[PDB]
Design a protein around this ligand. Structure first.
Ligand SMILES: CC(C)(COP(=O)(O)OP(=O)(O)OC[C@H]1O[C@@H](n2cnc3c(N)ncnc32)[C@H](O)[C@@H]1OP(=O)(O)O)[C@H](O)C(=O)NCCC(=O)NCCS
Ligand SMILES: CC(C)(COP(=O)(O)OP(=O)(O)OC[C@H]1O[C@@H](n2cnc3c(N)ncnc32)[C@H](O)[C@@H]1OP(=O)(O)O)[C@H](O)C(=O)NCCC(=O)NCCS
Ligand SMILES: CC(C)(COP(=O)(O)OP(=O)(O)OC[C@H]1O[C@@H](n2cnc3c(N)ncnc32)[C@H](O)[C@@H]1OP(=O)(O)O)[C@H](O)C(=O)NCCC(=O)NCCS
Ligand SMILES: CC(=O)N[C@H]1[C@H]([C@H](O)[C@H](O)CO)O[C@@](O)(C(=O)O)C[C@@H]1O
Ligand SMILES: *[C@@H]1O[C@H](CO)[C@@H](O)[C@H](O)[C@H]1NC(C)=O
Ligand SMILES: *[C@@H]1O[C@H](CO)[C@@H](O)[C@H](O)[C@H]1NC(C)=O
Ligand SMILES: *[C@H]1O[C@H](CO)[C@@H](O)[C@H](O)[C@H]1NC(C)=O
Lengths: 531, 531, 531
């Protein structure tokens, strides 16, 4: 008989799924609501509790994914999914759901560690269902929870004031964690041992929650994979008023006052807000006009509720959750995936510095390098060789360092300096599950670690013995971290803590410890951005 | 001067109306709100208390009737009204009102028994104003209250889950009873002696309230006239999701999720939902396609709030309050009115068993008889004789027994076996107030008892002397039941209690007691349905 | 390869279909446009010539049926179709199409007689595709053409003046005939020998075309089956402005002037006008209010273009240039189908005269009998018997006589006295293809002859030798009439011409001539209506 669990708001019916090598079937629950559908007047407001239900709710079908560009969303899902076949998902404003994968025998009491995944997608696209927690849950005996949160306009529209503070998507993540605290024990999980992990915008979300007083007792370990609160493209600093007005005008709304704009946008249909999203061209590199006025994403803002100050200031006052924190990046963060998705204008293979400077200026929204500083930045990375082909690869390294590498090390250093256990890694491997459209030379591209973390080798076909072992090792490290706040364990390479010696783990075919990740880069950039 | 009464929410102004034969004029109050208008966000949600008003509210005009097919509603009103002239009513979603007829002298303190009427109409049409309480009030010295409740989509739309549980119309009936308990004393009524009564869908509603915990202390006597919770066509069993989706699609709504459907439907205009209602062609026998898929009514469901389980489960569970209960039926419940209203195919008047079986299959939504059982059921009723004209008559008896006769006796037996006082009657009389298009041979058609219960002979012109005595006797029985929970009285024929001897009263030109109502019919159907 | 024919407007591709027993394949062409789609400004205007197309138009799919109540239209199609399985059709205002079934060898020059079918449906519903001309075409070697024309509001809305004369549906029928004349030769048909035939409203349409100057020289023989221009329910006399205003108001249009109502109605969407149709409750006996205000149909009006005066006036004038005309009726025109479709109130069997008179008054829109004349009419038909069951049978005969019987004979007599060949028949047979809901005792019900005329026994299953022979005979009579304007032929029962002896053919299991059809009834009614 299928598994039936009693939650605070009512009973839920899931399904058993067996994985080769494990006797105990994994209980899976899909589409459990953790908040009230943010429809009508609830749009652009904090999430409210879900209404209780009578009888048994069927939790065996995948929930819709929050409204987003349908094509872009399906593409990212197909590129990141760890399951054999990508499942098509429907769009809906009614998307505050979470999926649960528990390997615990529900007929007995269990208090397994809980790993709550927050998906990436630039806060504009993505879905929880893209990630199958079956393999991780079974292999490491942890309860895996995938959550969804409002995206794009619905999750991050901000007027910069009290009429629409913003960060609705982050408040949804907090609401999901609150639900986990109040209900996860019913699924064999330990509410006292919750780890939050995410990649890209998901990693940024983890970083933000670490800095938020609203997430105080909702987690005990954090993992940010390729993305932190210092990844500037995802955090809006300064006056956010101009963007709110552009969105309102594009939707056909007056901009008389903030309250007027929000009231008008609240009357728009889902389709109308989706059409506004498309006209805005989010997540695409605008090669026209002043680079400084382009906004490829709607994201995190300093609202005063979730975040009281900028991430940089919160780090200085060392005011944030000092729980164990693992921060990592991939060898080639800007190697293919991101530039492909953003229609980046790079297609030759050989790049001259003159062209590089022009491209770097157009990339302002991604790297925010004043035009007066472009020459230095470019000469610094490309000036050491006239091999136009090598200049091109060094150019991609430059973007990667500014977006993920440097921000990640700075975040880790500040966390370490607050006295909290810290760990770092650099992932370098090319999964066989890579897209056929991606050249073989790209190793450790954005998102490549996902196939290891979610045990893709055990759900998809064609993985080599090497890739299989890499996944087993990565999952064991992550799960050891989830239960102990330290990834180390018997039979695993030693992973030094990120202390004053700045040790970190180089993960790949040949996994080994090293020290001083991106040291010279942090020095260079911190100095350049100070000018 | 006009009658002015103080209610919890404010003062109300009524009007005096005298009925010859009685010196004390009857105070009449029309359109008193008992809940907040279920508009906008309140559509598909439980009734909220009415807001208080200042000064004196003029209760001298008939309130609108809840949105419904206007042609069908006006036709039913003209066919069932007990007044000289049918009163044309306006349609509106703002329809949660009740009318009061009190014979008490408001200058003194009175605690007369209260009779609350719940009108019928398949939960799709109907109105309170159709029934004038003047005669009953004045003749039997009881306070008569006629209530309205949401109908059709507005009153019963259900997604099968927490986003729209359903039974909004029944919740309104409960709300009206709560209002009576809190305010009726001001109108000379005794909140400690409330009798709920109704016929057809109204009778089914009374039966439902008897089974609902939400109304446990809201009434002390109950009367179900031609309709109970076991009248299957009014109660939906199993998954109600398909019907919800069909309605949403017809209204031009997406069916992505339950929350999405309800939200879209809450956005539709009253006119848009009325057009959806008309396109669904409710309350009409569908002769095309599979009979098992037709839905003539939107009604009661097992929501978890009003009903925690099916009436059958509750009955066996003996989980219902034991108030005195009068349950009755008419000699020919399916004799003319219902078949006429539902457009039943019966032009020829004759009927061979082959045609009979086909019609019975098409009547699946009304009788729910599996196709493989049709021959047995048909042979049972028509196989006794030839003369296709007689067979068609037995065919109408078959439908009547399945929809009203058997369900009523079964409910009566269960109530009796719970230790509660129970009474039964079979009304067999043809009122002169019947439609002119109705054959003189139809006696005791559905609704025929209403003219006697509401004293039409004293409000309408041209009643026969025999009809006048019949009404006086019927009102006496009903009013006696209201005050003592026993219909018996001086000058009235003896009405036996429905005990193990199963005595009941045959009401008509000649009124006398009898025993074992529908005994054999119940045995036959219980067994046939047991297969 | 598939058959390809060259028409005035372009090439068309059909399909070859072979009927059992006939080696010459029938070339079938479905959905050939004979007019420009009556959309936008073309609504409520005369049909315009179809626009020519390049290359080859694929005419292999059934065209949509003109906008109409979809449930009513689907039901009728199922009840009248001669094919094995009913073909579900789409609704559309783009419906001016015709289907062609030609048994001619297109590789050779042929000039076969052409029979053009005009479907019935009260001018409110119906479709051409319901009728498969395969059997008729193959068995009698005639080209069968089934046409469509605008229905309901779209085909007959009239303001009574030049802003919307009306009869758009009849103008469509005329345009189809004009198309046949200009194109049929290419399909092996003789434009010099066209026979128009139709049943019910289609029969009335044929009758109207015989009386219209617009249709002269467009056909050479006519057949009206159960319907003529004197069937008053289909012809509106007097002022039609009141009905136009009711339709405009229901549709939410102002009634300031005729030009304004029409302009507004033309701006409504197809769905809005269909909703108006549903709200109007057409084709249903209105049991409410004054029966003289009822309007169950939107039909023929005296526009001044199609009809210059009432059919009654045109008959005397002997203006209608002559052509051979066959006029027929069925034994029980009001036996089951029509009463069933119109929701006629006849649940019970037997009927008393008092009730009969009330029903006859409510039937005013169908029979047009002044209230002071109801007693006489009723006594004439029912006053000769006490058995109320028979009074019910006789009552149905009365309605049938006033609607079809008398009007048909009067038309035949007038045609005869105009000098043209005239023939009459009375069909008395119960098709095995009848609906299972129709009592076995109904014989010669409205539409019963259709199955014989269209060779249902050769397409559907179950037909007995007797039913098969009847169809062969009927198709033979019909085709001979189309060939020679005289149905008689070798091996067929003698069919006398309808002359001063008023001979007519009684068609059924036993077919033979007789004389003076409805003679006594015509005298009675002519005298009664003269009062
Ligand atoms: C491309 C992506 C960024 C989505 O973008 P988006 O929400 O659709 O917004 P965009 O402005 O980029 O729209 C681009 C348009 O280009 C066109 N296009 C063509 N080929 C395309 C491709 N391969 N990828 C994306 N867009 C494409 C489409 O017409 C699309 O228009 P649409 O709105 O009608 O679907 C990507 O699919 C995303 O899902 N991946 C995750 C990115 C995340 O990791 N970044 C974090 C910080 S960099
Ligand atoms: C017929 C009745 C069921 C109302 O139905 P409804 O809400 O209009 O829905 P329907 O699908 O039946 O509509 C039928 C259509 O048929 C046509 N019609 C023809 N003759 C009719 C008739 N005698 N009565 C009703 N409708 C008729 C109308 O055009 C109507 O169209 P509309 O929707 O534009 O008004 C009835 O009038 C009702 O008011 N009486 C009480 C029934 C109750 O006792 N039954 C409880 C369970 S058996
Ligand atoms: C019934 C018929 C007249 C169609 O009517 P209509 O265009 O739907 O308009 P109506 O007012 O009759 O609608 C009646 C309603 O009653 C209900 N109904 C129930 N049983 C029914 C039945 N057996 N037949 C017809 N309607 C029925 C339906 O809910 C229908 O609802 P809808 O309007 O939303 O579809 C018939 O189907 C027609 O197609 N046949 C041709 C009749 C023609 O030969 N007669 C000419 C002389 S009058
Ligand atoms: C599909 C479509 O648009 N419907 C049309 C079809 C298509 O030609 C065929 O289906 C091939 O696509 O047939 C017609 O063109 C035709 O018979 O003349 C009319 C019809 O409206
Ligand atoms: C639960 O939902 C699934 C997916 O729609 C369905 O297949 C299954 O039958 C449902 N179980 C029940 C009966 O609730
Ligand atoms: C013609 O239309 C039919 C529609 O069923 C289609 O199957 C066919 O491919 C089309 N082309 C031709 C002319 O064969
Ligand atoms: C309230 O309205 C009624 C209805 O017209 C009217 O008769 C009455 O006088 C009004 N109230 C007063 C007394 O002003």
């Amino acid at each position: 008989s299928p598994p039936v669990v009693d939650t605070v708001h009512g009973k839920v019916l899931g399904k058993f799924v067996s994985l080769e090598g494990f006797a105990q079937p994994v209980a899976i629950f899909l589409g459990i609501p953790f908040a009230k559908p943010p429809l009508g007047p609830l749009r652009f407001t904090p999430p409210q509790p879900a209404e209780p239900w009578s009888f048994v709710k069927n939790a065996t079908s995948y929930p819709p994914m929050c409204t987003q560009d349908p094509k872009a969303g399906q593409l990212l899902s197909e590129l990141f999914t760890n399951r054999k076949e990508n499942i098509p998902l429907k769009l809906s404003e009614d998307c505050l759901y979470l999926n649960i994968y528990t390997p615990a025998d529900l007929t007995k009491k269990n208090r397994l560690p809980v790993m709550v995944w927050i998906h990436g997608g630039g806060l504009m696209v993505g879905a929880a269902s893209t990630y199958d927690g079956l393999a991780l849950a079974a292999h490491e005996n942890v309860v895996v929870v995938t959550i969804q949160y409002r995206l794009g306009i619905w999750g991050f529209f901000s007027t910069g004031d009290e009429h629409s503070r913003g960060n609705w998507g982050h408040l949804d993540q907090v609401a999901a964690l609150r639900w986990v605290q109040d209900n996860i024990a019913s699924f064999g999980g330990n509410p006292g041992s919750v780890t939050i992990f995410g990649e890209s915008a998901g990693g940024e979300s983890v970083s933000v929650l670490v800095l938020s007083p609203l997430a105080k007792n909702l987690f005990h370990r954090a993992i940010s994979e390729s993305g932190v609160a210092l990844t500037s493209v995802l955090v809006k600093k300064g006056d956010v008023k101009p963007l709110a007005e552009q969105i309102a005008i594009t939707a056909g709304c007056k901009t008389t006052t903030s309250a007027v704009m929000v009231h008008c946008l609240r009357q728009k249909t889902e389709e109308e807000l989706l059409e506004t999203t498309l006209k805005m061209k989010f997540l695409s590199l605008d090669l026209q006009g002043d680079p400084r006025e382009s906004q490829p994403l709607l994201g995190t803002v300093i609202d005063g509720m979730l975040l009281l100050k900028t991430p940089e200031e919160l780090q200085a006052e060392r005011n944030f959750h000092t729980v164990p924190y693992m921060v990592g990046i991939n060898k080639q963060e800007f190697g293919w995936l991101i530039p492909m998705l953003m229609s980046y204008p790079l297609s030759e293979g050989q790049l001259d510095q003159k062209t590089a400077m022009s491209l770097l200026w157009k990339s302002y929204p991604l790297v925010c390098i004043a035009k007066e500083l472009i020459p230095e930045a470019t000469e610094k990375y490309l000036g050491g060789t006239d091999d136009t082909v090598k200049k091109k690869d060094l150019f991609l390294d430059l973007i990667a360092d500014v977006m993920f590498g440097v921000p990640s090390v700075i975040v880790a250093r500040n966390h370490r300096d607050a006295g909290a256990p810290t760990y770092m890694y650099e992932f370098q491997y090319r999964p066989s599950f890579s897209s056929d459209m991606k050249p073989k030379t790209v190793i450790g591209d954005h998102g490549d670690e996902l196939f290891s973390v979610f045990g893709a080798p055990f759900l998809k076909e064609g993985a080599s013995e090497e890739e299989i072992r890499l996944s087993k090792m990565v999952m064991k490290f992550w799960a050891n971290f989830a239960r102990n706040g330290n990834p180390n364990g018997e039979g695993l390479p030693h992973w030094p803590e990120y202390n004053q010696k700045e040790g970190y783990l180089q993960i790949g075919a040949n996994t080994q410890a090293a020290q001083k990740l991106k040291d010279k880069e942090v020095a260079f950039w911190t100095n350049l951005f100070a000018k």
